[PDB]
Specification:
The structure holds four protein chains of four kinds. Chain A is α/β, with parallel strands linked by helices. Chain A is about 35% helix and about 20% strand. Chain A has a six-stranded mixed sheet, with helices on both faces. Chain B has a single domain (about 1-125), classed as Roll (Mannose-Binding Protein A, Chain A). In chain B, strands 1, 2, 3, 5, 6 and 7 form a six-stranded mixed sheet that branches. In chain B, β5 (about 95-100) and β6 (about 105-110) form a beta hairpin. By secondary structure, chain D is an alpha+beta fold. The termini of chain D are close together. Classes of the chains: A alpha/beta, B alpha+beta, C mainly beta, D alpha+beta. At the B-D interface, β2, β4, β5 and β6 of B face β3, β4 and β6 of D. β4 (about 75-80) of chain B pairs antiparallel with β4 of chain D, so a sheet runs across the interface. Chain A: This is von Willebrand factor. Chain A: It comes from Homo sapiens. Chain C: It comes from Homo sapiens. Chain C: This is Glycocalicin.
Chain lengths: ~210, ~120, ~260, ~130
């Protein structure tokens, strides 16, 4: 069977749809973008990934949103984790968060067909879109809230949009934030984030 | 006293552009067009009359981007019941709009900055 | 089960039969089947009714099966999702009568030449309609009527040449409209309504920038942040705002939104 | 606590009135409605947002899109940009009256939770808030 065993003692076995949103602006060097992807693979490594447990998704964003992994893709964890590591560096002048959320609100979560499971959009931010693009930012985070989608922003660097990070965290309880200084601090904090994410999801009614 | 394609008035150099873009892009442009320039800034009626001429090339009814931007967030709000708050919690809570002049009758219109329009640039050397 | 794989989780019973080169519906399928995967099989023919013994079937997947005819008789009351993509249907099966709960209809990449009046007549809850990669040239006026709660519409990659002026009429929840890569030359006056299309794909079309393309010129200047570009990539599906993508005389040349309109009133 | 016909939340009396008036006429209406009466004030981050939200949404029931709230632009000008993009201070302005959006109401979409500024002249229903009588 596709199967594949758990790599670590921490193997999140819950009902959850986690969307990885990767900041794709030149605010991160080609080299740091790696550290980041590694973080996502790292995170993935610690989740029981299958349509009937933890469902991953991977979108890298600058002007538009690029999805290398869809929630419904039935593929082997090793594979999804492979695609994960191959997300092409973009480094755009501007990477819009309002956009990736719009994309996340209207595209990734337009249908909440797996209601029994928690929905989380991990928003890894390392830049700050121009104020002329945030006109609908709150509409989205609230809309995503209407859909029971928790938003957990992770700011990386002196360039991260702290204003938006703090608002998201204020929009709802569950919406916690992780402000960091550099892509390095990520694997150092991996466990806290993932333990926080996993614990925000329900257990299987059986087991 | 103004480079070609442009014009002159009261010691200023105005110029109309039929290029389409949102307020922020119009300003940007206007600046890059000639050091020390921004979007037209109507300081007097008779001034709004001359810019009215550099127009002619656009449909009647249309408007052009001008010196004023984000005119609702720059505001100071208040609750009829006195309830105080912290402006920080109010993130872009008002509509993001800019002002545009309509030559036809030179009446200003506060509309969404996002929209793409033409604009006039001015500056003084 | 001797043929298909079953798995119970939450309110759903998922049974996989895909990639099994089945020619007919396997026998003795779990009675409480919630979703059915008959994807990637041989089923050159299938009969809806043959599923009635399954009252709890919300999602049936027949995608990729060389389907030339769909048996629309009998009746499934809890089915909302139907995937008939990647098959060889010559005409759109009238699901109005047997499929009521149906919310998402997918028959993209089939060989549809046109669509009948009352095509969707009977499809009330429907919210997503995908008709990409078919041969359609023009659509039936007042088509999406029975489908007023419609959210996504993909008429992408087809052969459309005209668009029913009042096509998006009465739609108050349309967030995604896909019309990229076709043979359209102009939009009908007031074709977008006073709606608010978050996403609209119009690239890959031969627009004719004359005097009728101004209603579309304005709109393009009024919603430049709603003009998106669709693009696949073996391992990357993207959507990017780019009003400059829409342009009379495709390729990369003169954006419609820039069309001067000289010589026009 | 609260007078018949009003819902209460946090030691306060709230009420949605299906009577379309301009932002101005609504505040006065609220004022004369109860001692300390005013258009509802919403603490940006609190169950109150939701409260006033359900309070309307589950009753305004209509074709209406807005509900007047107590917040309003307090500046006297028509627009709040004191200077032009060139620094020159704004003196001679010529704004089209019905374009000045200086009053705030609750948007229908999403559940009457998000705020928006409109042309105060606009006749929309509203929500009053007042302390327990």
């Amino acid at each position: 069977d596709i199967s594949e065993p758990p790599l670590h003692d921490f193997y999140c076995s819950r009902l959850l749809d986690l969307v990885f949103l990767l900041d794709g602006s030149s605010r991160l060097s080609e080299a740091e973008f790696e550290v980041l992807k590694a973080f996502v693979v790292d995170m993935m490594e610690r989740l029981r990934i299958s349509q009937k447990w933890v469902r991953v998704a991977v979108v890298e964003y600058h002007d538009g949103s690029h999805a290398y992994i869809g929630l419904k893709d039935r593929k082997r964890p090793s594979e999804l984790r492979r695609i994960a590591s191959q997300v092409k560096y973009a480094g755009s002048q501007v990477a819009s968060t309002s956009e990736v959320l719009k994309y996340t609100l209207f595209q990734i979560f337009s249908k909440i067909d797996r209601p029994e499971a928690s929905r989380i959009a991990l928003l890894l931010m390392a830049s700050q879109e121009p104020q002329r693009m945030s006109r609908n930012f709150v509409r989205y985070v609230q809309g995503l809230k209407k859909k029971k989608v928790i938003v957990i922003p992770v700011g990386i660097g002196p360039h991260a949009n702290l204003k938006q990070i703090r608002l998201i965290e204020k929009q709802a309880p569950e919406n916690k934030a992780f402000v960091l200084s550099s892509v390095d601090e990520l694997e150092q904090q991996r466990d806290e984030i993932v333990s926080y994410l996993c614990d925000l999801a329900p257990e299987a009614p059986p087991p | 006293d103004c480079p070609p394609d442009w014009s002159s008035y009261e010691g200023h150099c105005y110029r109309f552009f039929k290029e389409w873009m949102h307020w922020d892009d119009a300003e940007e442009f206007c600046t890059e067009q000639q050091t020390g320039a921004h979007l037209v800034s109507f300081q007097s009626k008779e001034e709004a009359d001359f810019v009215r001429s550099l127009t002619s090339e656009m449909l009647k009814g249309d408007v052009v981007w001008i010196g004023l931007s984000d005119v609702w967030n720059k505001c100071r709000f208040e609750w009829t019941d006195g309830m105080e708050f912290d402006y920080d919690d109010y993130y872009l809570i008002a509509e993001y709009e800019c002002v545009a002049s309509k030559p036809t009758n030179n009446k200003w219109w506060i509309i969404p900055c996002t929209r793409f329009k033409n604009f006039v640039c001015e500056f003084q050397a | 089960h001797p043929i298909c794989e079953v798995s119970k989780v939450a309110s759903h019973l998922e049974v996989n039969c895909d990639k099994r080169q089945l020619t007919a519906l396997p026998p003795d399928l779990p009675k409480d089947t919630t979703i059915l995967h008959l994807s990637e099989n041989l089923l050159y023919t299938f009969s809806l009714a043959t599923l009635m013994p399954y009252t709890r079937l919300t999602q049936l997947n027949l995608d990729r099966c060389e389907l030339t005819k769909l048996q629309v008789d009998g009746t499934l009351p809890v089915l909302g999702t139907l995937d008939l993509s990647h098959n060889q249907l010559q005409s759109l099966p009238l699901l109005g009568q047997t499929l009521p709960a149906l919310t998402v209809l997918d028959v993209s990449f089939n060989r549809l030449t046109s669509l009948p009046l009352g095509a969707l007549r009977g499809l009330g809850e429907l919210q997503e309609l995908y008709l990409k990669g078919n041969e359609l040239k023009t659509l039936p006026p007042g088509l999406l009527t029975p489908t007023p709660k419609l959210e996504k519409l993909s008429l992408a990659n087809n052969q459309l040449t005209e668009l029913p002026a009042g096509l998006l009429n009465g739609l108050e929840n349309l967030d995604t409209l896909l019309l990229q890569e076709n043979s359209l030359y102009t939009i009908p006056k007031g074709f977008f309504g006073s709606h608010l299309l978050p996403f609209a794909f119009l690239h890959g079309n031969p627009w004719l920038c004359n005097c009728e393309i101004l209603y579309f010129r304005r709109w393009l200047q009024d919603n430049a942040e709603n003009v998106y570009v669709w693009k696949q990539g073996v391992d990357v599906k993207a959507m990017t705002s780019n009003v400059a993508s829409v342009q009379c005389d495709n390729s990369d040349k003169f954006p419609v939104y820039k069309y001067p309109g000289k010589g026009c009133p | 606590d609260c007078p018949s016909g009003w819902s209460s939340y946090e030691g306060n009396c709230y009420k949605f009135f299906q009577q379309k008036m301009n932002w101005a006429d609504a505040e006065r209406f609220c004022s004369e409605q109860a001692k300390g009466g005013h258009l509802v004030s919403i603490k940006i981050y609190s169950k109150e947002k939701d409260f006033v939200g359900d309070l309307v949404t589950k009753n305004i029931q209509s074709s209406d899109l807005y509900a007047w709230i107590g917040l309003r632009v307090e500046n006297k000008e028509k627009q709040c940009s004191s200077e032009w993009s060139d620094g020159s201070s704004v003196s001679y302005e010529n704004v089209v009256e019905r374009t000045v959006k200086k009053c705030f109401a609750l948007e229908k979409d999403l559940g009457f939770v998000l705020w928006i500024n409109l042309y105060c002249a606009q006749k929309n229903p509203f929500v009053c808030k007042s302390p327990p009588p």
